[PDB]
Amino acid sequence: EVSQDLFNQFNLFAQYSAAAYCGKNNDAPAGTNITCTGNACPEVEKADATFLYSFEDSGVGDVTGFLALDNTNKLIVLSFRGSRSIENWIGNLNFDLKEINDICSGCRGHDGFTSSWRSVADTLRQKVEDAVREHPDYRVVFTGHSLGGALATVAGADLRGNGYDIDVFSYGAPRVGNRAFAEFLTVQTGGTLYRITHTNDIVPRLPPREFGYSHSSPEYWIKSGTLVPVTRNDIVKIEGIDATGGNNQPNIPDIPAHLWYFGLIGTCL
Amino acid sequence: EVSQDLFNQFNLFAQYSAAAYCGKNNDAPAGTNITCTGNACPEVEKADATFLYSFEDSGVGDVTGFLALDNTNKLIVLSFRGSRSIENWIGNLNFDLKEINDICSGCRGHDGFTSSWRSVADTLRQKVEDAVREHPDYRVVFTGHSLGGALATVAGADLRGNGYDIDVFSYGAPRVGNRAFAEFLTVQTGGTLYRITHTNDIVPRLPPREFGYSHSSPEYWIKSGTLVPVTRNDIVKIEGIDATGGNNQPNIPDIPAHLWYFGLIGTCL
């Protein structure tokens, strides 16, 4: 169980994550409205949300997404797209652990995700902080589904501590680093990380523990099935580093469960 | 077992479905020969078959194929290509059920398949009906492998009942809609649906029943193995909505079985 307020935020940023997949939302002119196709992001359309920055084929690994200004909810939203291109999938396969001493000592992160973020950090950091200067009353939120959630998590860890809080909402995100990084993500201040999983989705189980990967805490686990609407009672908070009993169970994983986080996600053309 | 006459049709249109994958057959000039690479479609090449309309990157979902005029067999063949592009695959994943009451009452169909067809139906109907007018003694046949088989099925159900029969030959096609639609496809008049499957091919088992999908009846189940020539005694007719004992068995599915329908299907460059 989560509060209705937190449920509304989980639902909203799942739609911001879904919107990042739509092709027209990766080269949109600044100041234009954020829209999706196939009812992918109704709540985002209802809001007075526009593009501050729209990017695709950026850095290494085909970083893609947009930076949004939400005047209704008073948000600065950085939404990363998940895997769609061949270049995205190849970056996922770069799963050896690389030192990220510039984030925390003893921490190691997925080579692919960390390399991709490093390659766009300077540009996007400047875009976000320009927005905070213009709208200092707003709230900064990084979000993304799958690979996009892994990027939103790494980015949040790297840019926190510079005067503005950064909340992160990831959906079906894979493990991003070793246990040192997982513990750091669990105790870091300057914003909250909401790591949302769904039933037996396979992606949050990758890369496997045996390669040295761990999950941060807590986990918000959606128990309602695929194609089933989600209510605030279907989400379970699960505390503990590499906690079992949520998505991390010793049962058969599922691929279609990876595409149902409050609605269909990853399928917007 | 099936008759030799039906076996000959099953083999012929399996090769028309293969020709649709060949890139050269998706942007060819009208009136030119239909040819394939290797021995992908020797029976089509032997016929006096020419392009009426060759299309690619059409509508939504990257609809690809050709409309052919076969003077040897007296056919008007609309052949849809199966999955190859990333865009084809994103469309396959839009597996929510959408209303198609214009086709039949209470029927619901795969969102992607029905949205792809709807985006090209006006253009293709006109070309099919132009050919029927000029060649009223020719037989209209929609066909396709995998996704293409799903598009042929939908297009056939949508255009039937306008004066001319439309027969559909689908190979390794997934489920396309709900039970209402599966029953409509079973009893619809004005043409016959030949839904063909091969051993334990995985694709006719998608999307899973649990998501609300059913299969029309009957099923023509190829029992011979992969890379094994098919004889008319290897094909078994299986009647009953969502019938088991054919491809729909609770065993381990197979991927290479998806590519062997009389010959190799889906591999023409």
Added chain:
Amino acid sequence: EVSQDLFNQFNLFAQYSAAAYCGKNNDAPAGTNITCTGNACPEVEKADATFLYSFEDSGVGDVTGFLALDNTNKLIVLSFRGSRSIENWIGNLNFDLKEINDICSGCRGHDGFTSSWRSVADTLRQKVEDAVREHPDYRVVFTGHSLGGALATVAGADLRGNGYDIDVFSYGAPRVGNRAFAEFLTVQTGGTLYRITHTNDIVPRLPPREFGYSHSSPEYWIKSGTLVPVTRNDIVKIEGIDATGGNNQPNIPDIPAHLWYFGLIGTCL
């Protein structure tokens, strides 16, 4: 166990194979250095290795790779990229056996691999033999990982016997032909084939024996695990056509093992 000299050769050409995946190494000016990204080919970078010819999207099947001049080791290295593009994967799925009598009598090879090589054989033979004339004391070596190893295996069998030795180092290569071709690859004069496999990598088990495919002898089998450094004591030579007890064992296969051949291979962007 293998000798430290052979181990060093196995390690060097694993990095030449890894280099072929980097996009910048498929369209580089002749004479420029060969480099990779993130420690993918450190030994290649240390060497005085420059491009003689880089190719991409060549022939049929998206043949990709480079021809390198290594002055440090006195090598002419032809490195084929493995699977990355959709076109690559379609070619892999063309797995029926085709006559390659011009290479060896009674031999039959994978249709995709042999068609891909035939479509570039005249261009690449000219490039290799030009380099031989220019540096007649250098050693010619074909190498590749996965699909690249299969192309390197077929190319060496075709181009041997024209006045110079061709050594082949394949990593995680699939079976390329029938038994006759497997025997020929075992005994052919004018160079050596080092076929290297890793633990229970699935790819060297494809296509299955039951489709008529056989593996040449010997097999150099890496017993250390994924993400585990390799030492010369972890490699075991296994002789015999279609020998078991190495990679060819009736146990569960593994996909990540395919990417670890002394290091991460297939992941360079």
